[PDB]
Each structure stands twice: as structure tokens, then as C-alpha cells.
């Protein structure tokens, strides 16, 4: 179920960004829940994006993208949202999505930069997790035991 995997995501995001012992697994989830919520400014998406598979797809990006030395949650939320943006772009049920709820960073130039950095480092895995069920299970599993 969604929720459950989400906490694992949060869980993981705290074990990764250790440099912020003020963080709770609930925050990152609140951030993910928010955009997917407002995105329901209808005409944007008739169905919620965040699903088991999608969280997993998302944990997949965060996994190899979120630096361990992240300084300040704001930086986390930005990169996390960049990841979320790509997940929507690539796994999105709609043929597209807006950038309003994803750009929380100031320097627009940097948001698009990550988008390219991530795409260049994760493009293969983004397609594999879709084409290789066994790979989907390993990520799903790893995520499940990140709790």
C-alpha cells in the first residue's frame, strides 16, 4: 500500500541525509503528498500519481541521487521534488504535468540542471525497472526493508 512504502521512503531519506537530525520520515512524505494533492487542480490529473509502484520508482531515483551530505531540508525537498518531477514525467499517467508544485528552489537554472544530471545518470535504470520485473522486485524489496 502507498502510505507504508512512503514512510520507508522517508525512513530512507533520513538515513541518507544524516546531517539533519531534525528530520522525521513524515516530512518528506508530507512534501510528496502535497504536490500530488494540489496537482488535483483537475484537468491536470484525474487520478492520484503516488502509488506503490511509483513510490518505488521514485525511491529508485532518490537512492542514487540524494547526496548524503545534503545541507538543509530545503535542499532535500528541491532534489526530492526534482526526482518526483521526473517520475511524473516518465511514469505519469497523463501525457504531461506542470512545473508549479515542483519548483521550490530559487535559481530556476539549477532545477533544470538536476533534471539533466539525473536523466544522464538514471536513464538506463528508469527504463530497466520497467522492462525487468526482477529488477523491479529488488528495488521494491530494498525499499520495503529500508524501514
Amino acid at each position: 500500500s502507498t502510505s507504508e512504502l512512503l514512510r520507508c521512503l522517508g525512513e530512507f531519506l533520513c538515513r541518507r541525509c544524516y546531517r539533519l537530525k531534525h528530520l522525521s520520515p513524515t516530512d518528506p512524505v508530507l512534501w510528496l503528498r502535497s504536490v500530488d494533492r494540489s496537482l488535483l487542480l483537475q484537468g491536470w490529473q484525474d487520478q492520484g500519481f503516488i502509488t506503490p509502484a511509483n513510490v518505488v520508482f521514485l525511491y529508485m531515483l532518490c537512492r542514487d541521487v540524494i547526496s548524503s551530505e545534503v545541507g538543509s531540508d530545503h535542499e532535500l525537498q528541491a532534489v526530492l521534488l526534482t526526482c518526483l518531477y521526473l517520475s511524473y514525467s516518465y511514469m505519469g499517467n497523463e501525457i504531461s504535468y506542470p512545473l508549479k508544485p515542483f519548483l521550490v528552489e530559487s535559481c530556476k537554472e539549477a532545477f533544470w540542471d538536476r533534471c539533466l544530471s539525473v536523466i544522464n545518470l538514471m536513464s538506463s535504470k528508469m527504463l530497466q525497472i520497467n522492462a525487468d520485473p526482477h529488477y523491479f522486485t529488488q528495488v521494491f524489496s530494498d525499499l520495503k526493508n529500508e524501514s
Binding site: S89, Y90, M91, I95, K108, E109, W112, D113, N130
Partner: protein
Amino acid sequence: QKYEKLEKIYGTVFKAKNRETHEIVALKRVRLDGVPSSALREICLLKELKHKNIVRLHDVLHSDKKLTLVFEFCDQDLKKYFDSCNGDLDPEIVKSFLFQLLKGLGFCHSRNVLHRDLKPQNLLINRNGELKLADFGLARAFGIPVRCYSAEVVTLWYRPPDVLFGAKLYSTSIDMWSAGCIFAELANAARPLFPGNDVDDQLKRIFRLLGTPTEEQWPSMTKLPDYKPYPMYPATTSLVNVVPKLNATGRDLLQNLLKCNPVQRISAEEALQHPYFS
């Protein structure tokens, strides 16, 4: 910047010379202020789709608050090709084009990608006679058990009947139908085979020629979101009427591609292993 813009063919397309290595490419330039997310998907997919029959993506630049996809360059799109010559193509060209399309398409399916926007304008052709698939803006990966995709895919005239019937979930068979249409176009005056004015009209022209689907041949159709019981028009299946510059064997393939029931559509592999090809 290491480029030299020339005649100007998401954003707008340009022809160009690397200026440094002198190679000629094509630039897309996407405005970064849904279009972007579509663009980032194309980039992601293309990076993993390298095949002589799939347009190549050399690089991607982020400058002046714009994303420029540096693509390889092709002399012209199949639509313009149809205008180059007129009302006819040597039955041999017809074969070559379908072959390469079917091959470049068979590849995408094997790599788990639905193009979902197959039409003459998205097929590139070089004077060297080779054809390449292009514009993956509507493409997407598949494999993960998704609840459903989206029904706003594929231009009207190439949209398969199931999707017209509002189907939100589909398989690779969706690009196969478009392929069949393109084939029909290929083997005739190069005019679209089903040019309706709207969804309802699209459906009519299709059934008027292929014969309206019966619950027996396509059981799950009535359960579709936007299904409508159309009059049971005869099956003018004597396609010969609609595609003369095509043998009887060829017509057989065109018929297996234009099955209304998605499940009855031949796949690219099969299509390529079809007698019509020798």
C-alpha cells in the same frame, strides 16, 4: 553554442553545422517557460533507443532557459516525401519503408517502449532511402503493472478503434494499428486511409471499410468507457479496392495490422516474418 543555425525547419526545429566538427544536425529548442516534462521523457527514452531505424539524439544542452536537443539530421519527413513524388511509389519503396518502420518499431517494443504517435510526419527519410522513427514526445516505457495509461495518444487519423472507444489501457498493438494505416498510405496515393473530422467520424470510416466489430470477434469492446453501438456496416474487406499497388500477400498483412480488436493485431516480429517480405 558550438553550432551554426541555418534554414529553420515542442519548440521550433533547426538545421545546423557543428561548426567545429562540421557535421550537420537538427536542433529542437524547447521553451522552459507540460511541454518540458514531455521533452524530458523523450530524452530519457531516446538515450536508451539506439538503432539505425530510430532517430539519434547526439546531445542535450541547457542554455538561455531553453533545452536544445541536438538530433541527427534527416533530409525530410515521410509526409513531405509523399509530396516530393506524387500519387505513387514503386511497390519496392513501399516494402522498404514498411520494413524499416516495422524494424525500428519492433525494436522499441523489444526495449519496452510504446511510441504512441505513429504518423507519416513522425517518420524521417534520407535520400539514401533509409527511414527512421522520430518524435518520441508521446512515447513512454511500460512493464510495471500500471492501472492505466492515457487515452489522449496518437493523432486522430492513426488512432486505433479501441482507443477511440476511450480505452485508457493498451499494449504495443496500439502502434501496430498506426503502422497498418501508414502502410495503406504507403501503398496508395499516399493519402490517409481514414481521415475523419472527429472521433465519431473516425470510427465510421473505419467500420465502414473493415466492417463493424461484433461482440463475438471483440467481446471486451462493449465494456470500454466510450463504446458506442454503431450500425453493422458490411465488411468491404475486399481491400483491393482501397490499396491496388499491393499484391494479395501484401494485402493479407495490411489486414492483420488493421484488426479492430487490439489482441488480434499481429506484432512487429510477426509482421516482419510475414510472407509479404522476401
